[PDB]
Amino acid sequence: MRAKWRKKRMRRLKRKRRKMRQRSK
Amino acid sequence: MQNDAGEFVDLYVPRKCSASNRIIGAKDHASIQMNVAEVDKVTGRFNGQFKTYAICGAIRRMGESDDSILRLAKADGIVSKNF
Amino acid sequence: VRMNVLADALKSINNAEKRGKRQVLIRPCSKVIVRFLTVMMKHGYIGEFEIIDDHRAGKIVVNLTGRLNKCGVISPRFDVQLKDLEKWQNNLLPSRQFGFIVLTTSAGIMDHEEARRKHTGGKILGFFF
Amino acid sequence: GKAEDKEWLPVTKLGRLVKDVKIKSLEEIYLFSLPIKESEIIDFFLGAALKDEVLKIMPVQKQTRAAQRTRFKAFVAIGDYNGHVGLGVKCSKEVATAIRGAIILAKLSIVPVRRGYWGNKIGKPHTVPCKVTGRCGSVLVHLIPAPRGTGIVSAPVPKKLLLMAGIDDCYTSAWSCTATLGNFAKATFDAISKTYSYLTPDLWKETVFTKSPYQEFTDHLVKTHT
Amino acid sequence: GALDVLQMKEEDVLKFLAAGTHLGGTNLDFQMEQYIYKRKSDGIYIINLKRTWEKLLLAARAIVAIENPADVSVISSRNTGQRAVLKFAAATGATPIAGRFTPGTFTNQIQAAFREPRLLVVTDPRADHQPLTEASYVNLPTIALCNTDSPLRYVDIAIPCNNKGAHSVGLMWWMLAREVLRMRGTISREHPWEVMPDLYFYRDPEE
Amino acid sequence: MGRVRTKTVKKAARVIIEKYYTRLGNDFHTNKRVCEEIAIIPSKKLRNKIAGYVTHLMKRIQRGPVRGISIKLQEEERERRDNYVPEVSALDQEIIEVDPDTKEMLKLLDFGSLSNLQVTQPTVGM
Amino acid sequence: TKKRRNNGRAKKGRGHVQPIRCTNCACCVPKDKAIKKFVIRNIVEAAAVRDISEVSVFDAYVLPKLYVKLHYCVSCAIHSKVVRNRSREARKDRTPPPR
RNA sequence: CGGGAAACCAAAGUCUUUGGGUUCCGGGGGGAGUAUGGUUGCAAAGCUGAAACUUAAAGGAAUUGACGGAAGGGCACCACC
């Protein structure tokens, strides 16, 4: 199911990027 | 086809279907010409005289040629307008 | 819903001609349909026709002779002027030698060749060849 | 060796008649819409006036256990520049046999072409009689009448068939995959072929029937023949 | 035709009634409906007997109009018509085919059996379908004996009759041979014929 | 093992029987001598195989028809089932009954007067 | 490309249809996709019947039938040879096998 | 019937012989449903949504081979009992 897993991989990367940037200011 | 001098310029004039009034093409190999004997009125015997019809290939393959030949034979005197 | 009656009348004739049928029934009837049929009949493309009264707009039965290649409608009734009529007959007709556009004008419904003799423009209704 | 007679003896009723009696043209074969199956009939009526043209030679192949297996396909067109044209195709293991076979099928396929006028009717006709079209595969081809002395406005493939048919002036249009020369040639020959079976106001008068050649010569085929 | 010299007599109507010719199937095709009288209380169709005689005289007027009799071709692949087509072709000089028709007989110009006729007559449209569909390549007119469920797809004269088997098939070929010989002038329109109908029938129990 | 006979044997045996049926019989050793004088056969071993299948076919032809072979003796008795049979001296006679709807169909055609009548069941058979 | 006109299911004129659990593997599939087999047999085999009729206490007794209804998914029906794959034109035949 | 690249479709027809009314919406393959702003939510997240850069093909229907830890017939002590 590679497209469903590429979608899951992007969601966890975006959750990391969310928490990293919103801490800065 | 004629020109302004009134002379004719086609190679030939093609025939038309007796049932349908449409031109029969040079490669319509499903089409036919039908020929039918006349008989004398005193003794019911062949005098050598006859009548003719031409039928389009498209009308044959849909099954309408039998009824078309019958209507043509009732329009001429052969079936005598009763059945 | 039924937005236009003349488009039904011509589509119904056009499907019956292609099947090789000898008659067709048109319903509803209209003053515009009777005047359009008369122009095709006068030029020799259809046989004679009969109207049935039923107290609800009426019906027409038409006789077919096998000569008609097509008849049709232009849906927006665009205006035409004598200077622009050449562009329309260049678009819609199969040859310069035969076929007709039908116009409505203040002198009546007529053939596009008659509109030049009468020196008049109008609105487009349809065509036949 | 020397070109004496008896290179041909008929194998059909039509071939028995054409070699003997007053069947005087191809037009009385077209009028009764008969199939032609002997190539020598068209050499008898049109003969050395017919000129010949190879359009393309094309390789095609099938996969096998040992290797790819190749055949050569030839496309050929033929005509007399005055109202007759034909098209033919054959596929063989060698090019010389493919061309020789394609010429026979290009002769058996010949049709009559109609011609007309754009303007007033002065002289003899020179263009298509009305706007026409033909199809093959996805390819669509369309032909339009033109004023005297324009020539043919077309790509190379359709221009060669219209020249061999004997048409002087023509405007043309095409649609979808014209890069396939076989479908482009057949779509053009389909448009040309339809010109003599379009019902037009000069053809509206009633038809008068006659006997066919098999009926007029019904005793010649019996009394001394087999 | 209207003429008294062409009218159907009592003695022919009794021969139709005695052979089952008027009894169709349980099914009707929409092209055959004009040849039907009525459907029975048991689900069987009755073929109109005056419709048969008009279509049979129209078929004989087509067969007489060919100037060389060997140009007419006659066919039956079912057994019930094989004796009948062999007798019809003996009484008048047509070409018979009986049993299996070989595909390409009318269109494979090189073939050992190849022939090129002017008229084709067939016993049953559903069974004899190869020479019917093969006639569409060569401009060949067609006559056929049709039941109520026969498919009309290439036939130009259809003759309404029971064609299922036995006495009905043999009687139709005998009566067609009688009227082609009469109106060509070879036998009388009033004196009875010397050939008995029973000569055309198929294999009733012998002893 | 395998004793099936190839088309070279089976075709030569049929052509011999079509031409020389009156010479042949059930004895292999006499058939083997006949087949040597009516035909050119390149090998003794092929001659024995042809006379063998000819001997098999004669014993079949004594019982009934073989579809690939024809002889006068069998054709003239076919021609006696052809023509007319000894079965009857007259047709099956036209005195047959009529149903009420056929009586009505004949009434509209100005005919009848020679047939008995009876009615079918009250409702369509199931 | 589409393989079957019915999508391999009986559903026409409906949204949802209830599932069932298979008799071999307990996979979950729709009631109208599942392949059906209703089996009726004797409790005693055709070999064993004679031995059990002669030891019977009764002067007349008839041995009972066993009734079971079975459901398969496509994978179990193919692997257990209940159904075979077919030619492109043979797939259209809806009549059951001969007896 | 007629249409289509074909598989197929009584509509997926009545189309270069091109116009019954009207809503949403696609424009070679990727980067990308990503970055950034707005907005709704308790949260998970939903809706709206680029560009720089990169590339000669990616894709659909069908034909003949080869191949399968797919199925059915038949064969061989260079296979097995």
Swiss-Prot record, chain A:
Subcellular location per the Swiss-Prot or TrEMBL entry: Cytoplasm
GO cellular component terms listed in the entry, alphabetical order: cytoplasm; ribonucleoprotein complex; ribosome
GO biological process, one term: translation
Coarse class of the protein's main subcellular location: cytoplasm
Keyword field: Cytoplasm, Ribonucleoprotein, Ribosomal protein
GO molecular function: structural constituent of ribosome
Family to which this protein belongs: Belongs to the eukaryotic ribosomal protein eS32 family.
Function summary: Component of the small ribosomal subunit. The ribosome is a large ribonucleoprotein complex responsible for the synthesis of proteins in the cell. Interacts with the beta subunit of protein kinase CKII and stimulates phosphorylation of DNA topoisomerase II alpha by CKII.
Record's protein name: Small ribosomal subunit protein eS32
Species of origin: Oryctolagus cuniculus (Rabbit)
Gene this protein is translated from: RPL41
From Swiss-Prot, chain E:
BP GO annotations: ribosomal small subunit assembly; translation
Keyword field contains Disulfide bond: no
Modified residues (N6-acetyllysine): 50, 87
Site (Cleavage): 113-114, 131-132
Keywords noted in UniProt: Acetylation, Cell membrane, Cytoplasm, Host cell receptor for virus entry, Host-virus interaction, Isopeptide bond, Membrane, Nucleus, Phosphoprotein, Receptor, Repeat, Ribonucleoprotein, Ribosomal protein, Ubl conjugation
Post-translational modification: Acylated. Acylation may be a prerequisite for conversion of the monomeric 37 kDa laminin receptor precursor (37LRP) to the mature dimeric 67 kDa laminin receptor (67LR), and may provide a mechanism for membrane association. Cleaved by stromelysin-3 (ST3) at the cell surface. Cleavage by stromelysin-3 may be a mechanism to alter cell-extracellular matrix interactions.
Region spans: Laminin-binding: 159-178
Cross-link (Glycyl lysine isopeptide (Lys-Gly) (interchain with G-Cter in SUMO2)), chain numbering: 87
One cellular component term from this protein's GO annotations in UniProt: plasma membrane
Tagged with keyword Hydrolase: no
Residues bearing PTM Phosphothreonine: 95
Source species, domain of life: Eukaryota
Molecular function GO labels: laminin binding; laminin receptor activity; structural constituent of ribosome; virus receptor activity
Post-translational modification Phosphoserine, affected residues: 41
Family note: Belongs to the universal ribosomal protein uS2 family.
Protein name: Small ribosomal subunit protein uS2
Organism, scientific name: Oryctolagus cuniculus (Rabbit)
Swiss-Prot record, chain F:
Residue numbers of N6-succinyllysine PTMs: 19
Modified residues (Phosphoserine): 113
Post-translational modification: Ubiquitinated at Lys-103 by RNF14 and RNF25 in response to ribosome collisions (ribosome stalling).
Entry keyword Phosphoprotein: yes
SUPFAM superfamilies with a match to the protein in the record: Rps17e-like (SSF116820)
Subunit structure: Component of the small ribosomal subunit. Part of the small subunit (SSU) processome, composed of more than 70 proteins and the RNA chaperone small nucleolar RNA (snoRNA) U3.
Function: Component of the small ribosomal subunit. The ribosome is a large ribonucleoprotein complex responsible for the synthesis of proteins in the cell. Part of the small subunit (SSU) processome, first precursor of the small eukaryotic ribosomal subunit. During the assembly of the SSU processome in the nucleolus, many ribosome biogenesis factors, an RNA chaperone and ribosomal proteins associate with the nascent pre-rRNA and work in concert to generate RNA folding, modifications, rearrangements and cleavage as well as targeted degradation of pre-ribosomal RNA by the RNA exosome.
Similarity annotation: Belongs to the eukaryotic ribosomal protein eS17 family.
PANTHER family, per the entry: 40S RIBOSOMAL PROTEIN S17
Protein name as it appears in the record: Small ribosomal subunit protein eS17
Organism of derivation: Oryctolagus cuniculus (Rabbit)
UniProtKB/Swiss-Prot annotation, chain G:
One GO location term (cellular component): rough endoplasmic reticulum
In-chain residues carrying the UniProt-annotated modification Phosphoserine: 53
Pfam family, any one: Ribosomal_S26e
Biased composition regions of type Basic and acidic residues, renumbered to the chain: 86-96
GO molecular-function terms, A-Z: mRNA binding; structural constituent of ribosome
Annotated Gene3D superfamilies: Ribosomal protein S26e
Residues holding Zn(2+): 22, 25, 73, 76
Entry keyword Ribosomal protein: yes
Entry's transmembrane regions: none
Gene Ontology biological-process annotations: translation
Sorted UniProt keywords: Cytoplasm, Endoplasmic reticulum, Phosphoprotein, Ribonucleoprotein, Ribosomal protein, Zinc
Subcellular location: Cytoplasm, Cytosol; Cytoplasm; Rough endoplasmic reticulum
InterPro entries per record: Ribosomal_eS26, Ribosomal_eS26_CS, Ribosomal_eS26_sf
Predominant cellular place of this UniProt entry's protein: cytoplasm
Subunit structure of this chain's protein: Component of the 40S small ribosomal subunit.
Family classification: Belongs to the eukaryotic ribosomal protein eS26 family.
PANTHER family given in the database record: 40S RIBOSOMAL PROTEIN S26, SMALL RIBOSOMAL SUBUNIT PROTEIN ES26-RELATED
Function field: Component of the small ribosomal subunit. The ribosome is a large ribonucleoprotein complex responsible for the synthesis of proteins in the cell.
Protein name (Swiss-Prot/TrEMBL): Small ribosomal subunit protein eS26
Gene name per UniProt: RPS26
